[PDB]
Amino acid sequence: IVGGYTCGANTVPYQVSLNSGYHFCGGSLINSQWVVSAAHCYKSGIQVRLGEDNINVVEGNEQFISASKSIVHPSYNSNTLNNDIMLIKLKSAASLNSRVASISLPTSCASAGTQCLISGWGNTKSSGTSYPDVLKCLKAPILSDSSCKSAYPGQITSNMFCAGYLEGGKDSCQGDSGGPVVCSGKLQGIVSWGSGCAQKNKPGVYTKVCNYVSWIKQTIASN
Amino acid sequence: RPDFCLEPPYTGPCRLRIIRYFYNAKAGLCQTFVYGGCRAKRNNFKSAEDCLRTCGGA
Numbered sequence: 001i002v003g004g005y006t007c008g009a010n011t012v013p014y015q016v017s018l019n020s021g022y023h024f025c026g027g028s029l030i031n032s033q034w035v036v037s038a039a040h041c042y043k044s045g046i047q048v049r050l051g052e053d054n055i056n057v058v059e060g061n062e063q064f065i066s067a068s069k070s071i072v073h074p075s076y077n078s079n080t081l082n083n084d085i086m087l088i089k090l091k092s093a094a095s096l097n098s099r100v101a102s103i104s105l106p107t108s109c110a111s112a113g114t115q116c117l118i119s120g121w122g123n124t125k126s127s128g129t130s131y132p133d134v135l136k137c138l139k140a141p142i143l144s145d146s147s148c149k150s151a152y153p154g155q156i157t158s159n160m161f162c163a164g165y166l167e168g169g170k171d172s173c174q175g176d177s178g179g180p181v182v183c184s185g186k187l188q189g190i191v192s193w194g195s196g197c198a199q200k201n202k203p204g205v206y207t208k209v210c211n212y213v214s215w216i217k218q219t220i221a222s223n
Numbered sequence: 224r225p226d227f228c229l230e231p232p233y234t235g236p237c238r239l240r241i242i243r244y245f246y247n248a249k250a251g252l253c254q255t256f257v258y259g260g261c262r263a264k265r266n267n268f269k270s271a272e273d274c275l276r277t278c279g280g281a
Contacts, residue, residue, distance in 0.1 A: 020241075024241045038239070041239050175240035177259075178239065
């Protein structure tokens with residue numbers, strides 16, 4: 001997260017970290033045994049880390065639970081990045097509420113201008129490289145599909161949306177992928193891609209969750 | 224060595240943080256860099272060994 005701020009202690013209980021030896025992607029807990037992340041975050045042997053603002057602490061307040069199933073959307077396209085969403089089932093149920101609570105899925109899509117909260121342990125520098133020890137937060141508005149497509153001609157599908165500021169300075173970055181974009185207490189986005197980080201006229205692109213609610217529910221019910 | 228070995232490391236548009244290797248032609252050594260997760264170029268390897276076997280030879 002570039003141009004963000006240290007989230008309040010346990011203010012983002014639904015935020016999780018996908019681990020493969022170290023933190024590589026973020027994720028959102030949607031219930032006791034299911035996590036939603038980006039499809040490009042798929043790797044074998046993923047372990048999910050929950051309930052801990054500090055990404056390095058071991059034996060703190062965190063919980064490490066192995067992924068028992070990692071289901072990437074069946075139409076994920078690694079070239080166009082369309083349908084960039086994945087579901088991960090935890091081997092065992094996690095303890096909820098305190099520092100680990102699920103985020104509700106949307107009942108309807110958000111609108112441009114709607115202010116949302118984006119979080120992650122990604123890079124905090126747009127040009128350099130500085131990864132934080134604690135979870136970072138950022139308030140960013142959803143941008144009009146019109147300005148999104150103008151920013152990335154021929155790259156935005158109906159399953160994506162832009163959020164952030166065209167002036168640059170504030171945006172998600174490498175290390176934030178799979179992370180949540182919460183608007184009015186609802187998970188509307190998943191950190192996906194962008195041209196660089198926090199660059200002018202190059203806002204962040206996010207997976208449009210409201211388009212996969214049915215897929216998420218049915219997948220969870222069948223597995 | 225293949226010409227793609229002379230290209231600078233490409234992080235890409237995606238936003239995950241995974242370590243990969245690339246041949247740094249200027250240093251003549253394979254080194255690590257942060258790959259973003261998608262649209263990788265050929266100078267991107269999962270181990271120093273593979274990077275060296277592919278890009279090490281003159």
